[PDB]
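Archive entry. Fields below.
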Amino acid sequence: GLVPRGSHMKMIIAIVQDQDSQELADQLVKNNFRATKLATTGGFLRAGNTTFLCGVNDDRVDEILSVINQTCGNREQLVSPIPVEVEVGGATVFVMPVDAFHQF
Amino acid sequence: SGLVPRGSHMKMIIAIVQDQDSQELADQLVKNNFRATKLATTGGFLRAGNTTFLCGVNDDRVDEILSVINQTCGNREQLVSPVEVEVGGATVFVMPVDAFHQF
Amino acid sequence: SGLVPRGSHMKMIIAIVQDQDSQELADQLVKNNFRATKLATTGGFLRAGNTTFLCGVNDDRVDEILSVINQTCGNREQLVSPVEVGGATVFVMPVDAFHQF
Ligand SMILES: Nc1ncnc2c1ncn2[C@@H]1O[C@@H]2COP(=O)(O)O[C@H]3[C@@H](O)[C@H](n4cnc5c(N)ncnc54)O[C@@H]3COP(=O)(O)O[C@H]2[C@H]1O
Ligand SMILES: Nc1ncnc2c1ncn2[C@@H]1O[C@@H]2COP(=O)(O)O[C@H]3[C@@H](O)[C@H](n4cnc5c(N)ncnc54)O[C@@H]3COP(=O)(O)O[C@H]2[C@H]1O
Ligand SMILES: Nc1ncnc2c1ncn2[C@@H]1O[C@@H]2COP(=O)(O)O[C@H]3[C@@H](O)[C@H](n4cnc5c(N)ncnc54)O[C@@H]3COP(=O)(O)O[C@H]2[C@H]1O
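PREDICTED_STRUCTURE:
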């Protein structure tokens, strides 16, 4: 496997809005984070979103989380019902353990 | 930071279900305040469409989410054509989560 | 209530492979009785299609599944431009429980 002795990888599963996905992807690339992206849909709104799977060494988790925050952070937008302020953007991130990482 | 209180644990549920049951599962998850993200997937053996749900849940609600999945997507008998067939079925993985964040 | 015998452990294999190798990997998984669910994905760098396989496997068959992936997708590098793109990237992840309903 590719993990040095005593170190650990994590799997980041980040669910972000489609409007922020290209900017996140560009920033992950710029910071040399590898990603795989999935076109997904939310259970509540049933609208398209984007899920990123990023395998990262534990020592770069805080950095990836800051990239995701800077690009996909929650913010307000005025909309008209049927002008009110609503939350848009935002990221939901799971950090999961990885036992091994291989490249063939 | 992270959304998990000290000493508690989250789990990630990966549920692979049939396409015909996916809308009822999604409705029931919503009704019970479970969040989900869904993926259109295909099976390795039959190469036919199915649906994969990713649900991050607190450990204390795992049994509850499993029961919702079972009730809505469990394997069962159905008359068609009148012939009896097996329909539905869910495969579920419960996986550990180190941290959970919202930004 | 799960499918995992007492004292044993399941793992989730997440294998990201190129679309050109996907069908042959799928056939070999099937032939060796490995279950897989496939996801149509795209790479973060090249933004081009690839395939992600999720395979829940008992720990005692992890080395075998890795050797299937290697035999089918390994030594399969190609240079491309939007860059070495490998045969397979595989994560082995822990699973607490496994259920069929
Ligand atoms: N039962 C409920 N009651 C009241 N409000 C509800 C609700 N379910 C969802 N919402 C609201 O709807 C937003 C979009 O949820 P959706 O399921 O379409 O789209 C979600 C979903 O695809 C994913 N997600 C969030 N938490 C998740 C989890 N625990 N597991 C899996 N996916 C999750 O992230 C997207 C953004 O979620 P976020 O939490 O930022 O934003 C949520 C939340 O503000
Ligand atoms: N350990 C695991 N890891 C990842 N994904 C998993 C999994 N177990 C199940 N799945 C997913 O769940 C679907 C339903 O599988 P199930 O075992 O209910 O129902 C299966 C099973 O009854 C049968 N089957 C699958 N592979 C087989 C094999 N090698 N030999 C005999 N029967 C097989 O065909 C059905 C459809 O399989 P298919 O592959 O098309 O579709 C699968 C697959 O997408
Ligand atoms: N740690 C990880 N987490 C999640 N997914 C992962 C991953 N490592 C690899 N992948 C997935 O596997 C595909 C093939 O990766 P590989 O590293 O062989 O081949 C890579 C690598 O040789 C190169 N590459 C990727 N990012 C790079 C960067 N920032 N700088 C230079 N080369 C890069 O581009 C190839 C294609 O990358 P692409 O992103 O389109 O597609 C990737 C991505 O979808």
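CURATOR_NOTE: The CA atoms of residues 23 and 99 of chain B lie 29 Å apart.
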